[PDB]
Amino acid sequence: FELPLPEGWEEARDFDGKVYYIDHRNRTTSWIDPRDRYTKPLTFADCISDELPLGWEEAYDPQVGDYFIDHNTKTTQIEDPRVQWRREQEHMLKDYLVVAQEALSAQKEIYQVKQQRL
Amino acid sequence: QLMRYQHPPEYGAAR
């Protein structure tokens, strides 16, 4: 569905005929369609569509509930593979925080007590 | 950058 502008917003044209948007609630103007907040990715890493990748299929069973089918590997799983993938990203970053922090603290405990070997 | 940033019209332009 094509959203209408939010209440208080108005589409306008500048002296050159370029479209811009007027926000009457905040008495401001913008080149940015305020509907872009819902339809454009937030960053270059974001993706608005949640559609599953090639070969994956959402499925349902009255006892198990929602689950997922991977036609690529001929397997099924309960966990959302999108969530799984994100968490494996997250886990790799967190593992590094822990490893790096431990390394840095060990390096500093050594550097210190070279003058406190005593 | 070689193109200058163009700001939108101020609030309250002619209708």
Residue numbers in the entry:
A (entry chain A): 4 to 121
B (entry chain C): 277 to 291
What do the authors of the reporting publication say about this deposited model?
WW domains organize molecular assemblies by binding to short, proline rich peptide motifs each with ~4–6 residues. To achieve this goal, we determined the high resolustion structures of 7 representative WW tandem/target complexes, and measured the binding constants of >100 WW domain tandems or isolated WW domains binding to known or previously unknown targets.
Unexpectedly, the KIBRA WW tandem binds to AMOT PY34 with a high affinity (Kd ~96 nM), although the PY3 sequence severely deviates from the canonical WW domain binding PY-motif of ‘PPxY’. We solved the high-resolution crystal structures of KIBRA WW tandems in complex with PTPN14 PY12, AMOT PY34 and LATS1 PY23. Correspondingly, KIBRA WW2 has an Ile (I81) instead of a highly conserved Trp at the end of the β3-strand (e.g. W34 in WW1). A residue in the PY-motif linker (R440 in PTPN14, Q282 in AMOT and G553 in LATS) uses its carbonyl group to form a hydrogen-bond with the sidechain of Trp34. The C-terminal extension of PTPN14 and that of AMOT form additional hydrophobic and charge-charge interactions with the WW1 domain.
